[PDB]
């Protein structure tokens, strides 16, 4: 008895099982649709430090997957390469059908070592991990996924009104992270600017900030040196908060731009 939403006159009335309302008309199975809506649209924190907290590892529960016919572009998607600290596999390899989430503005690729208590990784929020029209309850290794929930819809009159046209470019950038103690409270992440330069990661940092940081490091960060890989603590030294608003929020406009000079860098050690 999953709730089946009925769209009438561009208004969403969830259906009533017992009522068998005469009005609603299901002409064909085309009208039936499953929609996978991302969590990022729900106002949840979407940065990898906070997002990892919602994911969790448990064992003794079999993984399940569902198909969602249509999905929403996700600003942030995550690809995990977690391995156990001895190098053992932590996340199950993707089954043949499973493929990466189709449309992602920012792919957060986390490769690192973490305690891996459970056989599989599950979403503590109850949501599904969306993979290319397949919604799973378990994280699969090395496949881009966007955490989301699946909604089932009865589309209106199949008159091309909904999901057939835009009533009214795909460029995906990979933000590569490295993590230790993945899946525990004591987790630390390093944003990987390049092979030799890493930046300590905090929740405040947004993907736009991280890309700007990458540019700033490249232009004037003296990233290349013989000392070794450099881990930099970074703080935007601007009075306003960094990326409080969500991606949709205020169309991300009139947003203060943190010129390269504002960012402050110190070497952790």
């Amino acid at each position, epitope marked *: 008895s999953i709730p089946l939403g009925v769209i009438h006159n561009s208004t969403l009335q969830v259906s009533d099982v017992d009522k068998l309302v005469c009005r609603d008309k299901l002409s064909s199975t085309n009208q039936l649709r499953s929609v996978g809506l991302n969590l990022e649209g729900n106002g949840v924190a979407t940065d990898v430090p906070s997002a990892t907290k919602r994911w969790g590892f448990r064992s003794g529960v079999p993984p399940k997957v569902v198909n969602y016919e249509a999905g929403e572009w996700a600003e942030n998607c995550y690809n995990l390469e977690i391995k156990k600290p001895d190098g053992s596999e932590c996340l199950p390899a993707a089954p043949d059908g499973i493929r990466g989430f189709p449309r992602c503005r920012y792919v957060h690729k986390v490769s690192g070592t973490g305690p891996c208590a459970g056989d599989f990784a599950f979403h503590k929020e109850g949501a599904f991990f969306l993979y290319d029209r397949l919604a799973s309850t378990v994280i699969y290794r090395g496949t881009t996924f966007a955490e989301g929930v699946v909604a089932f819809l009865i589309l209106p009159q199949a008159k091309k009104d909904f999901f057939s046209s835009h009533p009214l470019g795909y460029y995906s950038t990979t933000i590569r992270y490295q993590a230790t103690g993945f899946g525990t409270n004591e987790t630390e992440y390093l944003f990987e600017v390049d092979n030799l330069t890493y930046v300590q990661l905090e929740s405040r940092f947004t993907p736009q900030f991280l890309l700007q940081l990458n540019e700033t490091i490249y232009t*004037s960060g003296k990233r290349s040196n013989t000392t070794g890989k450099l881990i930099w*603590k970074v703080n935007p030294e601007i*009075d306003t908060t960094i990326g409080e608003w969500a991606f949709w929020e205020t169309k991300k406009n009139l947003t203060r731009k943190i010129r390269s000079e504002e960012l*402050s860098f110190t070497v952790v050690n």
Partner: antibody
Amino acid sequence: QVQLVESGGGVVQPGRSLRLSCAASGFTFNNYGMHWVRQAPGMGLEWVAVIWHDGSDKYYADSVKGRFTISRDNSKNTLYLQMNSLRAEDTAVYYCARNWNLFDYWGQGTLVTVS
Amino acid sequence: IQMTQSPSSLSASVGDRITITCRASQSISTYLHWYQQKPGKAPKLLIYAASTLQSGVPSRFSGSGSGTDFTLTISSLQPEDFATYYCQQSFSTPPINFGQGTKLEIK
């Protein structure tokens, strides 16, 4: 309208610890690293110490590598420079600064004389 | 790592056209900062990135530079402008060093 107010100072003979506090108002203390810059009576200002925005990481000038320790408490919007060891040449005015990269805002100095 | 203001001292008329230059040991990519200190007064920043000016600075306080060489230019001098100036690098922030700056005075 950010106001940085220095405090402490006074006259101390060499070797007694002195604690300096720079009050902070009108800006968010949490996200700004702060600096301690000492300006000699006529010789000119020399940087003394800096602290990271959260307070975790603190760097000192070569002359003062161990003698002076800097600290901040974000809750009170105050930073403290602990003058553990005092030498006569330390006598000068002390200025706090509001930003790690660029000393955008300097508080009115506090006079410290070692005597 | 070492920043030097080429003109050790300068003197000029109340309305004179004067400029100052800062010498860098390394090459600083638009990361020099200009500070003006009146006598017996707290130093005050002027130019964020050796080009970008602060909100409260007079327009005449415009300087430009890149790489190793940086300059600060005062199109028209003023009575208050007769004060020392300083330039700071931003590349090697942990050992920030201030160097004695030009003492602007009447010519």
